[PDB]
Symmetry: C2
Subunit: 123 residues, 2 copies
Amino acid sequence: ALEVLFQGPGNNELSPVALRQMSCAAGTTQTACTDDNALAYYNTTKGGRFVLALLSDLQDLKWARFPKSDGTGTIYTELEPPCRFVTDTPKGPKVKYLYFIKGLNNLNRGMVLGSLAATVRLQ
Amino acid sequence: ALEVLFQGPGNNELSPVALRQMSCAAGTTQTACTDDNALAYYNTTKGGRFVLALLSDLQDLKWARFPKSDGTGTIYTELEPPCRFVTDTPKGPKVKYLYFIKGLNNLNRGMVLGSLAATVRLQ
């Protein structure tokens, strides 16, 4: 499914890599992050899991929480004010909110917007 | 086919719009732009046709030429150094070169990279 063109690994070459999806817990505060109520889109990277955006039904989200792979702790990441779009889901049309990670650069912001576009448009 | 999520028209809403494709003439110099040897991806915009990137088989391109819609003249746009990727075409695998318009901002650069990604990856 979802893909993005990675600027790399070498030269000026372009490699398609997967924009993977995982369930995650978000909320209005760090304490608020209870159960799984959003979908995080991420790249695997030199740091590890790099999360670019969350997709959720809620519009109040300001925080997302991820447990480290290893199991040695958790990370709380700040979300930007969301973006709303409509997509025709199996249960009918619904508003979805797209939260970019706070501080996400314009290139990665564009990669997500281009990558999701065909599936938002599909009915 | 190709789509991108437009940040607009209002609020923080997201609208899927088509990333349209048109044949065009490119070359190593402005004079070199002879016949149709590339594919320009463009948005329709408040200025008119906004071209974001060219896709071509040639790797020597530095210029692209578009006749104005109206017919009152032509535009020569400067291309950035290209990016190469491989895609399995009906005639087998071929290298393609992606030329971003000179000065293209990172958001639009990312939108193109994300939008093309699923079709590069497909066989």
